[PDB]
Curated annotation (Swiss-Prot), chain A:
ARM repeats lie at residues 1-40, 41-80, 81-122, 129-173, 175-211, 212-251, 254-293, 296-338, 339-385, 386-425. Belongs to the importin alpha family. The chain holds residues 72 to 497 of 529 of the full protein. It comes from Mus musculus (Mouse). Slightly detected in brain but not in cerebellum and skeletal muscle, highly expressed in testis and spleen. This is Importin subunit alpha-1.
Amino acid sequence: GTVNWSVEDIVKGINSNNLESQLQATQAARKLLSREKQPPIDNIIRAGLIPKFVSFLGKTDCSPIQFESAWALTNIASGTSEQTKAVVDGGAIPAFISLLASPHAHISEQAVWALGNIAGDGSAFRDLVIKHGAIDPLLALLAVPDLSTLACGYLRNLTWTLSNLCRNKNPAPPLDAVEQILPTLVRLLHHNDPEVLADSCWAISYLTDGPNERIEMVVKKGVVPQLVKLLGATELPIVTPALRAIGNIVTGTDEQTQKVIDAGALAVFPSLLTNPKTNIQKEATWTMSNITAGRQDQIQQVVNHGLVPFLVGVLSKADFKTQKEAAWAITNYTSGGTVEQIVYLVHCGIIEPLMNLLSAKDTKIIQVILDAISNIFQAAEKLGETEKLSIMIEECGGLDKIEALQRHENESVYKASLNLIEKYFS
Amino acid sequence: RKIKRQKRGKR
């Protein structure tokens, strides 16, 4: 009969001098806080119950009240930043870290969960959890010869909490903390549970979202081939973070991008660039745009894998944001590519969709497309085929679009368009 | 050229 208690009754029980009455009331609070219909978190906080729960976390010889208070506090910490803050202000971080070593698995797991919510609030609470020394006991829980001997839910909660310890920026997690976490993270990235894999990929995607030194920390552990494998996974919750991480990595140096290419990533992009999930297509086209910004041999690898027709396709038809990413990929390709590669791009049919996209209201995409067209015209000049390109552009209706752009609000736009008209359409 | 560009309750 710990169901549908009032906050007043919970308070009466917790303020009793009776450990069992306190346990009953704490379980009643846990049940109140574990309902999907507007859990009365703020009422529980206003009642002043957080410090009592925290003190209960330390009652070693009453493991039930440890568990019930840990669960109640976990659900409080799962709410707004102010509610998580109320939990932290009650002294919960060191108590939960001390619980991580509990001989009862459900209590240690609940402490893992609570620390995950706290760390996931933001960079400050993440770093505060780290300062209290959570990483060592967390990783100690995972120091087993074979991860398959752990309970599935326990392992999933550990992975999610570690991922939250890798999450958030301004600042990014401490470098020493990342180095301490990464080996276990790679081990988890090779685990066979789909949720563990998804959360490990999210962690890696966080760690690779930053300067090239962070990307290097990750790539040095040799995870790129496993990331490409997971990029081939059937589960969207795995592919999404895998692709996000690969994109992050190819925002780095040409050597890191080359590690992505060598692992076989481009072979997956025919499907990714046609994926029915809009976000997958957009992220894959963004990754392609940063690969085409690389060296000429890397552009050539893009060509060899047959991805230029897929870029033409996405430019021809896709969500407008994906089309913007595709236009950027084309501009990078044309800015860095050889004359032969640019000619090949034209032979694949880039001109007509590129010109069709010059009717968009977005100014940035117009600038991008005009720069790409200028680069293609420069290649044609180097081949002395500018007249052929001008005729092609005129046949698809692009000359009309550029002439109209000559009188466009933005400045760079009309300047570039007038330059094109004067230089190649006289 | 290159462009750099949670919580869970129980029950």
